[PDB]
Amino acid sequence: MKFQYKEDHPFEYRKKEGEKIRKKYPDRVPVIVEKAPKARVPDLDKRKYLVPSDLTVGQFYFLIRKRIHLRPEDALFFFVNNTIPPTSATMGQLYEDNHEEDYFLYVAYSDESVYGK
Amino acid sequence: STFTNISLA
């Protein structure tokens, strides 16, 4: 897994920003959303998202898909730590199980059901 | 960079 947010900011920078945003919004989670490398999906204008913890992963799927503006026939899959996250889980629940030491949740999207495919 | 707040509406 590779993210352009890590190429732009070292860990010590990411940790300070993720630590401050979590103390300011304890009921929200910071999420980095980027396109998988070999994905044939349009790009997002923004990659840093502040998500309500009670929003489900399925609802987060639909909100990101609308921002990417996909055709109805376009497939879209999400990946957290090389695994498709559960639909019924909340973003706060997914954050607690998968956040990195910089207090960020990293999510990649692609048209393929395998991360690097 | 600045966070964008995600909401259902």
Author numbering:
A (entry chain A): 1 to 117
B (entry chain B): 12 to 20
Give me lines lifted from the publication on this model.
Autophagy-related 8 (ATG8) proteins play a central role in autophagosome formation and selective delivery of cytoplasmic cargo to lysosomes by recruiting autophagy adaptors and receptors. The LC3-interacting region (LIR) docking site (LDS) of ATG8 proteins binds to LIR motifs present in autophagy adaptors and receptors. A genome wide siRNA screen identified the short coiled-coil protein (SCOC) as a novel positive regulator of starvation induced autophagy. To further understand the role of SCOC in autophagy, we identified a functional LIR motif in the unstructured region N-terminal of the coiled-coil domain of SCOC.
GABARAPL1 was used instead of GABARAP, since purified GABARAP aggregated during concentration. In both structures SCOC formed the same canonical LIR interactions with GABARAPL1 for the SCOC WT LIR-GABARAP complex. Furthermore, we observed multiple additional contacts in both structures: Hydrogen bonds were formed between the carbonyl of pS12SCOC-2pS/S12SCOC-2pT and K48GABL1, as well as between R28GABL1 and the carbonyl of I17SCOC-2pS or the sidechain of N16SCOC-2pT. Moreover, we detected some hydrophobic contacts between L19SCOC-2pS/2pT and the edge of HP2. Similarly, in the SCOC-2pT LIR crystal structure, pT13 was not interacting with GABARAPL1, but pT15 in position X1 formed salt bridges with K46GABL1 and R67GABL1. In the SCOC-2pT LIR:GABARAPL1 complex structure phosphorylated T15SCOC formed two additional salt bridges with K46GABL1 and R67GABL1 of GABARAPL1. Both K46GABL1 and R67GABL1 are conserved in both LC3 and GABARAP proteins. Additional electrostatic interactions therefore may also occur between phosphorylated T15SCOC and the corresponding residues (K49LC3A/B/K55LC3C and R70LC3A/B/R76LC3C) in LC3 subfamily proteins. In our crystal structure phosphorylated S12SCOC formed a large network of hydrogen bonds with H9GABL1, K48GABL1 and R47GABL1, whereas phosphorylated T13SCOC was solvent exposed and not interacting with LDS amino acids of GABARAPL1. This lack of interaction explains why phosphorylation of T13SCOC of the SCOC LIR domain did not enhance GABARAP subfamily binding. Phosphorylation of T15SCOC at position X1 of the SCOC LIR motif also increased much stronger the binding affinities of LC3 subfamily proteins (especially LC3A and LC3B) than of GABARAPs.
